[PDB]
Curated annotation (Swiss-Prot), chains A, B:
<feature type="binding site">
    <location>
        <position position="6"/>
    </location>
    <ligand>
        <name>8-oxo-dGTP</name>
    </ligand>
</feature>
<dbReference type="InterPro" id="IPR003563">
    <property type="entry name" value="8ODP"/>
</dbReference>
<feature type="binding site">
    <location>
        <position position="6"/>
    </location>
    <ligand>
        <name>N(6)-methyl-AMP</name>
    </ligand>
</feature>
<dbReference type="GO" id="GO:0006979">
    <property type="term" value="P:response to oxidative stress"/>
</dbReference>
<feature type="binding site">
    <location>
        <begin position="33"/>
        <end position="36"/>
    </location>
    <ligand>
        <name>8-oxo-dGTP</name>
    </ligand>
</feature>
<feature type="binding site">
    <location>
        <position position="34"/>
    </location>
    <ligand>
        <name>Mg(2+) 1</name>
    </ligand>
</feature>
<comment type="subunit">
    <text>Monomer.</text>
</comment>
<feature type="binding site">
    <location>
        <position position="53"/>
    </location>
    <ligand>
        <name>Mg(2+) 2</name>
    </ligand>
</feature>
<feature type="binding site">
    <location>
        <position position="50"/>
    </location>
    <ligand>
        <name>8-oxo-ATP</name>
    </ligand>
</feature>
<keyword id="KW-0496">Mitochondrion</keyword>
<feature type="binding site">
    <location>
        <begin position="115"/>
        <end position="118"/>
    </location>
    <ligand>
        <name>8-oxo-dGMP</name>
    </ligand>
</feature>
<feature type="binding site">
    <location>
        <position position="21"/>
    </location>
    <ligand>
        <name>8-oxo-dGMP</name>
    </ligand>
</feature>
<dbReference type="GO" id="GO:0047693">
    <property type="term" value="F:ATP diphosphatase activity"/>
</dbReference>
<feature type="binding site">
    <location>
        <position position="31"/>
    </location>
    <ligand>
        <name>8-oxo-dGTP</name>
    </ligand>
</feature>
<feature type="binding site">
    <location>
        <position position="21"/>
    </location>
    <ligand>
        <name>O(6)-methyl-dGMP</name>
    </ligand>
</feature>
<feature type="binding site">
    <location>
        <position position="98"/>
    </location>
    <ligand>
        <name>Mg(2+) 1</name>
    </ligand>
</feature>
<dbReference type="GO" id="GO:0008413">
    <property type="term" value="F:8-oxo-7,8-dihydroguanosine triphosphate pyrophosphatase activity"/>
</dbReference>
Length: 154, 154
């Protein structure tokens, strides 16, 4: 009962790219780039595709950095989120009707306007750690319970 | 907002001692031996004392093997349980009005008539692993959420 999603962080030595969702769901928050994985498509290919669609950037190799499972109380489907990082990109970030990308210096990451789980796992990503997490949500703003640990193998 | 408790498992190569609580709280289940720690008493001394009180056995050195925190929904105080093991004891187990001790072969540990958290951490103890756990209970029979991991240092 899990649906695959990807999440991509463009993390460079002094800054990280995030996107402000402008409409529909998740509007108002900063987040990484990603989406659903297609039938017959690899998870990594889906991650590369969604990075382009949402940010305008072209990535070659993506690196696996985490897996997070989200449970939403009252919803049957779990989200199985495969998290990736890259430092090398081509192109410059594109603002669209859906998404407004911006670079953040690492000390200015806007945690108060990001999903609450990011406060837990993003700091691991910044120190080049890999992780497995599980977050149980009630609505969009409340973590009821979670687990998180560093791993050697994603 | 945590209260200290001890829990002692007499674990020998082929068998483990458990006690059937005969009355009051916990009646009807098999469990290890322990209780509250006194003012001015070390946690280990409290563990040794309670092993004698509840089982009739004298232990010298106890070995630290785990820490488990219990939360009961609707109750303010958490239980901070310090878990110990020993293989060497003196005396023979004593049945009292409060407790009926019995030896169990390791393949016959009565998990269905033990507290539900034991199904998670007891197998770690059997393989000489050390652990930190947290269990959130609703009533006596339902684990709502938990975390458990092996540790090098209790
Ligand atoms: C990028 C975003 O990240 C998060 C979303 C959420 C989240 C919270 N609520 N939702 C709802 C749950 C009800 N179904 C629609 C998404 C999604 C929590 N933490 C995140 N890091 C996201 C979204 Cl919108 C949708 C699927 C995802 F896998 C992710 Cl990572
Ligand atoms: C030996 C027993 O072990 C467990 C008790 C419980 C438990 C479940 N409910 N309770 C109630 C909670 C309400 N306050 C009285 C104890 C205790 C769960 N798992 C255990 N392994 C126990 C008891 Cl009765 C009391 C305090 C403890 F620290 C332990 Cl380990
Ligand atoms: Cl995100
Ligand atoms: Cl027990």
């Amino acid at each position: 009962a899990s649906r695959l999603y990807t999440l991509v962080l463009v993390l460079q030595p002094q800054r990280v790219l995030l996107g402000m969702k402008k409409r529909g769901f998740g509007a108002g928050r900063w987040n990484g780039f990603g989406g659903k994985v297609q039938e017959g498509e690899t998870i990594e290919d889906g991650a590369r595709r969604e990075l382009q669609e949402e940010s305008g950037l072209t990535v070659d190799a993506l690196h696996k950095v985490g897996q997070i499972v989200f449970e939403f109380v009252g919803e049957p489907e779990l989200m199985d989120v495969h998290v990736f990082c890259t430092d090398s990109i081509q192109g410059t970030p594109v603002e669209s009707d859906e998404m407004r990308p911006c670079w953040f210096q690492l000390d200015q990451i806007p945690f108060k306007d990001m999903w609450p789980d990011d406060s837990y796992w993003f700091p691991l990503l910044l120190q080049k750690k890999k992780f497995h997490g599980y977050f149980k949500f009630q609505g969009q703003d409340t973590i009821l319970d979670y687990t998180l640990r560093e791993v050697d193998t994603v």
